[PDB]
Amino acid sequence: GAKPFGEKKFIEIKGRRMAYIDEGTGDPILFQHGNPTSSYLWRNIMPHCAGLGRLIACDLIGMGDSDKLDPSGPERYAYAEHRDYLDALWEALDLGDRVVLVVHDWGSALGFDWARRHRERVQGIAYMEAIAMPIEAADLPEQDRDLFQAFRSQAGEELVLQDNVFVEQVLPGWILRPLSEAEMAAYREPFLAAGEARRPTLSWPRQLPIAGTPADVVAIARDYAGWLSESPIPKLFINAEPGALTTGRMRDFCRTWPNQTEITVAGAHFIQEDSPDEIGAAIAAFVRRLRPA
Ligand SMILES: [Ca+2]
Ligand SMILES: [Cl-]
Protein backbone atom coordinates (compact mmCIF):
# COMPACT_ATOMS: atom_id res chain seq x y z
CA GLY A 1 0.00 0.00 0.00
CA ALA A 2 0.95 3.61 -0.85
CA LYS A 3 -1.37 5.22 1.65
CA PRO A 4 0.17 7.06 4.60
CA PHE A 5 -0.75 5.94 8.13
CA GLY A 6 -2.52 8.56 10.28
CA GLU A 7 -2.90 12.34 10.10
CA LYS A 8 0.01 14.73 10.21
CA LYS A 9 0.03 17.03 13.21
CA PHE A 10 2.32 19.99 13.70
CA ILE A 11 4.16 21.64 16.58
CA GLU A 12 6.32 24.82 16.42
CA ILE A 13 9.79 23.99 17.74
CA LYS A 14 12.18 27.00 18.02
CA GLY A 15 10.10 28.91 15.45
CA ARG A 16 9.76 25.96 12.97
CA ARG A 17 6.89 23.56 12.24
CA MET A 18 7.68 19.94 12.77
CA ALA A 19 5.40 17.29 11.47
CA TYR A 20 4.52 14.04 13.18
CA ILE A 21 2.03 11.20 13.41
CA ASP A 22 0.52 10.36 16.75
CA GLU A 23 -2.20 7.72 16.99
CA GLY A 24 -3.65 5.90 19.94
CA THR A 25 -3.31 6.11 23.70
CA GLY A 26 -0.89 4.65 26.26
CA ASP A 27 2.83 4.28 26.52
CA PRO A 28 4.47 5.45 23.30
CA ILE A 29 6.11 3.54 20.48
CA LEU A 30 8.28 5.86 18.52
CA PHE A 31 9.23 5.17 14.93
CA GLN A 32 12.21 7.15 13.68
CA HIS A 33 13.27 7.26 10.05
CA GLY A 34 16.60 8.37 8.54
CA ASN A 35 17.91 9.55 5.15
CA PRO A 36 16.19 10.32 2.80
CA THR A 37 12.81 9.16 3.96
CA SER A 38 10.17 10.43 6.35
CA SER A 39 7.42 8.91 8.54
CA TYR A 40 6.01 7.60 5.28
CA LEU A 41 8.65 4.85 5.56
CA TRP A 42 6.76 3.34 8.45
CA ARG A 43 3.25 3.43 6.91
CA ASN A 44 2.88 -0.38 6.47
CA ILE A 45 4.58 -1.26 9.73
CA MET A 46 2.81 0.98 12.23
CA PRO A 47 -0.63 -0.69 11.68
CA HIS A 48 0.73 -3.90 13.13
CA CYS A 49 1.16 -2.13 16.44
CA ALA A 50 -2.27 -0.56 16.75
CA GLY A 51 -3.69 -0.75 20.27
CA LEU A 52 -0.31 -1.54 21.86
CA GLY A 53 0.38 2.10 22.61
CA ARG A 54 0.72 5.62 21.32
CA LEU A 55 2.19 5.33 17.85
CA ILE A 56 4.39 8.25 16.99
CA ALA A 57 6.50 8.90 14.01
CA CYS A 58 8.26 12.21 13.49
CA ASP A 59 9.58 13.86 10.35
CA LEU A 60 13.10 15.12 11.03
CA ILE A 61 13.71 18.82 10.47
CA GLY A 62 13.99 19.60 6.75
CA MET A 63 12.45 16.23 5.82
CA GLY A 64 8.95 14.99 5.09
CA ASP A 65 6.41 17.66 5.99
CA SER A 66 8.60 19.43 8.53
CA ASP A 67 10.02 22.84 7.80
CA LYS A 68 13.27 23.57 6.11
CA LEU A 69 15.87 25.57 8.09
CA ASP A 70 16.49 29.13 6.92
CA PRO A 71 19.23 30.04 6.06
CA SER A 72 20.60 26.80 4.73
CA GLY A 73 24.06 25.80 3.62
CA PRO A 74 26.93 23.38 4.19
CA GLU A 75 26.93 23.96 7.99
CA ARG A 76 23.23 23.20 8.42
CA TYR A 77 21.49 19.93 9.20
CA ALA A 78 24.44 18.40 11.02
CA TYR A 79 23.76 15.69 13.58
CA ALA A 80 23.88 18.13 16.51
CA GLU A 81 21.24 20.38 15.01
CA HIS A 82 18.88 17.57 14.17
CA ARG A 83 19.37 16.29 17.67
CA ASP A 84 18.40 19.65 19.12
CA TYR A 85 15.10 19.72 17.21
CA LEU A 86 14.17 16.18 17.80
CA ASP A 87 15.04 16.37 21.54
CA ALA A 88 12.77 19.37 21.84
CA LEU A 89 9.96 17.66 19.87
CA TRP A 90 10.12 14.56 22.04
CA GLU A 91 9.95 16.78 25.12
CA ALA A 92 6.85 18.55 23.82
CA LEU A 93 5.08 15.32 22.97
CA ASP A 94 5.03 14.33 26.74
CA LEU A 95 6.37 10.83 26.21
CA GLY A 96 6.58 9.54 29.81
CA ASP A 97 8.98 6.87 31.06
CA ARG A 98 8.13 3.61 29.22
CA VAL A 99 9.14 4.43 25.68
CA VAL A 100 9.71 1.85 22.95
CA LEU A 101 12.06 3.09 20.20
CA VAL A 102 11.91 1.69 16.70
CA VAL A 103 14.71 3.02 14.61
CA HIS A 104 16.34 2.96 11.19
CA ASP A 105 19.51 4.53 9.58
CA TRP A 106 20.13 8.03 11.07
CA GLY A 107 17.01 7.54 13.12
CA SER A 108 19.07 4.93 14.97
CA ALA A 109 21.91 7.31 15.63
CA LEU A 110 19.44 9.80 16.99
CA GLY A 111 17.42 7.26 18.94
CA PHE A 112 20.37 5.38 20.35
CA ASP A 113 21.96 8.60 21.57
CA TRP A 114 18.72 9.81 23.08
CA ALA A 115 18.20 6.46 24.77
CA ARG A 116 21.65 6.73 26.22
CA ARG A 117 20.97 10.19 27.62
CA HIS A 118 17.62 9.05 29.01
CA ARG A 119 18.19 5.42 29.83
CA GLU A 120 15.73 5.24 32.70
CA ARG A 121 12.95 6.16 30.29
CA VAL A 122 13.41 3.38 27.81
CA GLN A 123 11.46 0.16 27.80
CA GLY A 124 12.73 -1.37 24.58
CA ILE A 125 14.61 -0.72 21.35
CA ALA A 126 13.97 -2.28 17.97
CA TYR A 127 16.46 -1.36 15.30
CA MET A 128 17.31 -2.18 11.78
CA GLU A 129 19.98 -1.07 9.31
CA ALA A 130 21.38 1.14 11.95
CA ILE A 131 24.53 3.10 12.55
CA ALA A 132 25.48 1.01 15.56
CA MET A 133 29.11 2.17 15.81
CA PRO A 134 31.85 4.08 14.02
CA ILE A 135 33.03 2.41 10.84
CA GLU A 136 35.83 2.32 8.28
CA ALA A 137 35.68 2.83 4.51
CA ALA A 138 35.94 -0.91 3.96
CA ASP A 139 32.63 -1.44 5.84
CA LEU A 140 30.59 0.29 3.23
CA PRO A 141 29.32 -2.03 0.50
CA GLU A 142 31.75 -2.38 -2.39
CA GLN A 143 29.28 -0.99 -4.94
CA ASP A 144 28.30 2.16 -3.05
CA ARG A 145 31.65 3.11 -1.42
CA ASP A 146 32.89 5.50 -4.14
CA LEU A 147 29.61 7.33 -4.46
CA PHE A 148 29.49 7.97 -0.73
CA GLN A 149 33.07 9.26 -0.90
CA ALA A 150 31.98 11.62 -3.62
CA PHE A 151 29.13 13.02 -1.45
CA ARG A 152 31.70 13.67 1.22
CA SER A 153 33.82 15.66 -1.24
CA GLN A 154 33.19 18.91 -3.11
CA ALA A 155 31.40 16.95 -5.81
CA GLY A 156 28.50 16.36 -3.39
CA GLU A 157 26.74 19.68 -4.07
CA GLU A 158 26.34 19.00 -7.81
CA LEU A 159 25.41 15.34 -7.18
CA VAL A 160 22.76 15.96 -4.56
CA LEU A 161 21.56 19.58 -4.77
CA GLN A 162 21.33 19.61 -8.58
CA ASP A 163 20.88 15.96 -9.57
CA ASN A 164 19.19 14.67 -6.40
CA VAL A 165 21.12 11.44 -6.52
CA PHE A 166 20.26 10.32 -3.01
CA VAL A 167 16.56 10.22 -3.84
CA GLU A 168 16.73 9.16 -7.50
CA GLN A 169 19.51 6.51 -7.27
CA VAL A 170 20.45 5.49 -3.80
CA LEU A 171 16.87 5.12 -2.56
CA PRO A 172 15.53 2.91 -5.40
CA GLY A 173 18.87 1.15 -5.68
CA TRP A 174 18.68 -0.03 -2.09
CA ILE A 175 15.21 -1.51 -2.36
CA LEU A 176 14.96 -5.04 -3.84
CA ARG A 177 11.57 -4.35 -5.55
CA PRO A 178 10.53 -1.44 -7.82
CA LEU A 179 8.44 1.32 -6.16
CA SER A 180 5.13 2.40 -7.68
CA GLU A 181 4.80 5.90 -9.21
CA ALA A 182 2.77 6.92 -6.13
CA GLU A 183 5.40 5.63 -3.66
CA MET A 184 8.23 7.46 -5.41
CA ALA A 185 6.11 10.62 -5.41
CA ALA A 186 5.77 10.57 -1.68
CA TYR A 187 9.54 10.15 -1.16
CA ARG A 188 10.32 12.80 -3.78
CA GLU A 189 7.91 15.39 -2.46
CA PRO A 190 10.06 17.22 0.08
CA PHE A 191 12.98 17.38 -2.35
CA LEU A 192 11.43 18.46 -5.66
CA ALA A 193 13.06 21.86 -5.59
CA ALA A 194 16.78 21.84 -6.60
CA GLY A 195 19.09 23.65 -4.18
CA GLU A 196 18.87 23.95 -0.43
CA ALA A 197 15.61 22.00 -0.13
CA ARG A 198 17.88 18.96 -0.72
CA ARG A 199 20.61 19.98 1.71
CA PRO A 200 19.49 17.45 4.30
CA THR A 201 20.09 14.53 2.01
CA LEU A 202 23.69 15.75 1.48
CA SER A 203 24.46 16.79 5.05
CA TRP A 204 23.57 13.32 6.30
CA PRO A 205 26.21 11.23 4.49
CA ARG A 206 28.67 13.89 5.42
CA GLN A 207 27.96 13.05 9.07
CA LEU A 208 28.61 9.36 8.72
CA PRO A 209 31.27 8.43 11.23
CA ILE A 210 33.87 7.02 8.85
CA ALA A 211 37.58 6.69 9.51
CA GLY A 212 37.42 8.97 12.53
CA THR A 213 35.60 11.87 10.88
CA PRO A 214 33.63 13.94 11.66
CA ALA A 215 35.03 13.57 15.12
CA ASP A 216 32.05 14.70 17.16
CA VAL A 217 29.71 12.09 15.58
CA VAL A 218 32.42 9.49 15.97
CA ALA A 219 32.52 10.13 19.66
CA ILE A 220 28.75 10.14 20.06
CA ALA A 221 28.46 6.80 18.24
CA ARG A 222 31.40 5.43 20.17
CA ASP A 223 29.58 6.34 23.41
CA TYR A 224 26.23 4.81 22.47
CA ALA A 225 27.95 1.69 21.07
CA GLY A 226 29.67 0.99 24.37
CA TRP A 227 26.52 1.69 26.33
CA LEU A 228 24.27 -0.47 24.14
CA SER A 229 26.63 -3.45 24.40
CA GLU A 230 26.31 -3.13 28.21
CA SER A 231 22.63 -2.25 28.55
CA PRO A 232 20.04 -4.67 29.84
CA ILE A 233 17.28 -2.86 27.94
CA PRO A 234 15.48 -5.41 25.78
CA LYS A 235 16.27 -5.19 22.10
CA LEU A 236 14.93 -6.38 18.79
CA PHE A 237 17.48 -6.64 16.00
CA ILE A 238 15.90 -6.89 12.62
CA ASN A 239 18.65 -8.15 10.47
CA ALA A 240 18.51 -7.81 6.72
CA GLU A 241 19.83 -10.33 4.14
CA PRO A 242 21.87 -9.12 2.30
CA GLY A 243 21.47 -5.81 4.11
CA ALA A 244 23.73 -2.84 3.48
CA LEU A 245 24.84 -0.87 6.52
CA THR A 246 24.39 -3.36 9.35
CA THR A 247 26.66 -6.01 7.97
CA GLY A 248 30.20 -7.23 8.49
CA ARG A 249 31.75 -5.97 11.73
CA MET A 250 28.80 -3.85 12.65
CA ARG A 251 26.53 -6.82 12.43
CA ASP A 252 28.89 -8.99 14.54
CA PHE A 253 29.06 -6.28 17.13
CA CYS A 254 25.25 -5.85 17.29
CA ARG A 255 24.85 -9.55 17.85
CA THR A 256 26.97 -9.28 21.04
CA TRP A 257 24.38 -7.00 22.68
CA PRO A 258 22.62 -8.31 25.72
CA ASN A 259 18.91 -9.05 25.98
CA GLN A 260 18.37 -9.14 22.27
CA THR A 261 16.13 -11.13 20.04
CA GLU A 262 16.85 -11.26 16.34
CA ILE A 263 14.99 -12.02 13.15
CA THR A 264 16.20 -11.90 9.64
CA VAL A 265 14.20 -10.51 6.74
CA ALA A 266 14.82 -9.98 3.07
CA GLY A 267 16.11 -6.58 2.05
CA ALA A 268 18.98 -4.25 1.35
CA HIS A 269 18.82 -0.98 3.24
CA PHE A 270 15.19 0.24 3.15
CA ILE A 271 13.80 -3.03 4.33
CA GLN A 272 10.43 -1.52 5.30
CA GLU A 273 9.66 -1.43 1.62
CA ASP A 274 10.55 -5.10 1.03
CA SER A 275 9.31 -7.01 4.08
CA PRO A 276 6.93 -4.71 5.96
CA ASP A 277 4.72 -7.48 7.19
CA GLU A 278 7.56 -9.51 8.77
CA ILE A 279 8.99 -6.43 10.39
CA GLY A 280 5.66 -5.20 11.70
CA ALA A 281 4.73 -8.62 13.08
CA ALA A 282 8.02 -8.93 14.95
CA ILE A 283 7.83 -5.48 16.40
CA ALA A 284 4.29 -6.13 17.61
CA ALA A 285 5.27 -9.44 19.24
CA PHE A 286 8.23 -7.70 20.95
CA VAL A 287 6.02 -4.94 22.29
CA ARG A 288 3.47 -7.53 23.45
CA ARG A 289 6.15 -9.32 25.42
CA LEU A 290 7.16 -6.07 27.09
CA ARG A 291 3.54 -5.04 27.71
CA PRO A 292 1.54 -8.09 28.77
CA ALA A 293 -1.99 -6.94 29.73
CA1 LIG B 1 16.33 32.04 2.51
CL1 LIG C 1 23.25 8.97 4.86
From Swiss-Prot:
Changing E241Q: 38% of wild-type activity. It comes from Sphingobium indicum (strain DSM 16413 / CCM 7287 / MTCC 6362 / UT26 / NBRC 101211 / UT26S). Optimum pH is 8.2. Chloride binds at N35, W106. This is Haloalkane dehalogenase. Induction: Constitutively expressed. One of its GO terms (biological process) is response to toxic substance. Changing N35 to D/E/F/Q: Loss of activity. GO terms for molecular function: haloalkane dehalogenase activity.
